Amino acid sequence: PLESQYQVGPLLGSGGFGSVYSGIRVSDNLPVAIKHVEKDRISDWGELTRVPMEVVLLKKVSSGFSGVIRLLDWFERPDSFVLILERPEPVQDLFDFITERGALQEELARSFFWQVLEAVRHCHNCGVLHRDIKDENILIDLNRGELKLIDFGSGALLKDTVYTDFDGTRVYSPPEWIRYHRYHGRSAAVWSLGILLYDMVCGDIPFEHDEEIIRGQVFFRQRVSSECQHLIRWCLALRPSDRPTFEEIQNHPWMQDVLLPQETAEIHLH
Ligand SMILES: NCCN1CCC(CCN2c3ccncc3Oc3ccc(Cl)cc32)CC1
């Protein structure tokens, strides 16, 4: 049924997550993305039937609308799982967008960062921790100015006790992971959000090496408002408990007067 119901297009990319192709649902020409994950490469299984955790997590968050790319269907094969995902068109991931345009104007960063926060809050509400929030896991719908989270393959069920496993991106990983191999979900997520916001407004990540992460001293190579600097330094507090909650991030002075997605695309994307 997979082969008949979907028309496969170019390979979009491949990496730790498997291989993802552009596709079309033949029933209604809906643009889709088709993701293949080798069973041998899945270290983390769940249940609804053994499936990749990613399918569990996506089902938990794909109800209703949000800034999360929705799981439309999945299929099992002898050696792989195949996931059918939404595909916005036209689209560009945030990594490529920042690579092309450099550091983002603050008005644009504010709009993007706000939408990431809303998406992450929605995940956490649904009982899901992404654990790999970063520029290349964020898609921009270029027409609507809407951001969408992708790749839940390092994610987990949200819990209030310590995590001692981590499979995300090291340079977005918090100091408590680097030093102790332990973190709690929400505060680790806030650290990664601080890395992301710095990335947006400076056009690069703040820390390359473990020693810099642990030192946690933030230097700005680009002109950034005092206010944006303050939010970033707050998210990147060395002690997890000195970090802001999502509520405190969204009530921060830098986060006031966000543009709506559509006006963001008119001003900055069209
Ligand atoms: N610097 C970018 C170079 N490439 C990096 C890989 C990228 C594929 C992204 N992708 C995805 C990647 C991993 N898990 C789920 C995914 O679900 C998607 C749904 C819909 C679209 Cl359009 C894309 C995805 C393609 C670009």
Swiss-Prot record:
SMART domains assigned: S_TKc (SM00220)
Positions of post-translational Phosphoserine modification: S63, S226
Induction or repression: By interferon-gamma (IFNG). Strongly induced in leukocytes by the JAK/STAT pathway in response to cytokines. Induced by different cellular stresses, heat shock and cytotoxic agents.
Enzyme Commission number, as recorded: 2.7.11.1
Listed SUPFAM superfamilies: Protein kinase-like (PK-like) (SSF56112)
Cross-referenced Pfam families: Pkinase
Gene Ontology MF terms: ATP binding; manganese ion binding; protein serine kinase activity; protein serine/threonine kinase activator activity; protein serine/threonine kinase activity; ribosomal small subunit binding; transcription factor binding
Keyword Nucleus carried by entry: yes
Annotated ATP binding sites: L12, G13, S14, G15, G16, F17, G18, S19, V20, K35, E86, D93
UniProt GO cellular component terms: cytoplasm; cytosol; nucleolus; nucleoplasm; nucleus; plasma membrane
Gene3D superfamilies for this protein: Phosphorylase Kinase, domain 1, Transferase(Phosphotransferase) domain 1
Tissue occurrence: Expressed primarily in cells of the hematopoietic and germline lineages. Isoform 1 and isoform 2 are both expressed in prostate cancer cell lines.
Every Protein kinase domain range: 6-255
Cofactor: Mg(2+)
Family annotation (CDD domains): STKc_PIM1 (cd14100)
Single GO BP term: negative regulation of innate immune response
Keywords from the named record: Apoptosis, ATP-binding, Cell cycle, Cell membrane, Cytoplasm, Host-virus interaction, Kinase, Magnesium, Membrane, Metal-binding, Nucleotide-binding, Nucleus, Phosphoprotein, Proto-oncogene, Serine/threonine-protein kinase, Transferase, Ubl conjugation
Active site: D132 (proton acceptor)
Xref: InterPro entries: Kinase-like_dom_sf, PIM1/2/3, PIM_Ser/Thr_kinase, Prot_kinase_dom, Protein_kinase_ATP_BS, Ser/Thr_kinase_AS
PTM text: Autophosphorylated on both serine/threonine and tyrosine residues. Phosphorylated. Interaction with PPP2CA promotes dephosphorylation.
Record annotation: effect of changing L158F: Decreased kinase activity
Subunit structure: Interacts with RP9. Interacts with HSP90AA1, this interaction stabilizes PIM1 protein levels. Interacts (ubiquitinated form) with HSP70 and promotes its proteasomal degradation. (Microbial infection) Interacts with Epstein-Barr virus EBNA6; this interaction upregulates and stabilizes PIM1 and induces cell proliferation by inhibiting the growth suppressive properties of p21.
Biological role stated in the UniProt entry: Proto-oncogene with serine/threonine kinase activity involved in cell survival and cell proliferation and thus providing a selective advantage in tumorigenesis. Exerts its oncogenic activity through: the regulation of MYC transcriptional activity, the regulation of cell cycle progression and by phosphorylation and inhibition of proapoptotic proteins (BAD, MAP3K5, FOXO3). Phosphorylation of MYC leads to an increase of MYC protein stability and thereby an increase of transcriptional activity.
Membership in a protein family: Belongs to the protein kinase superfamily. CAMK Ser/Thr protein kinase family. PIM subfamily.
Protein name in the entry: Serine/threonine-protein kinase pim-1
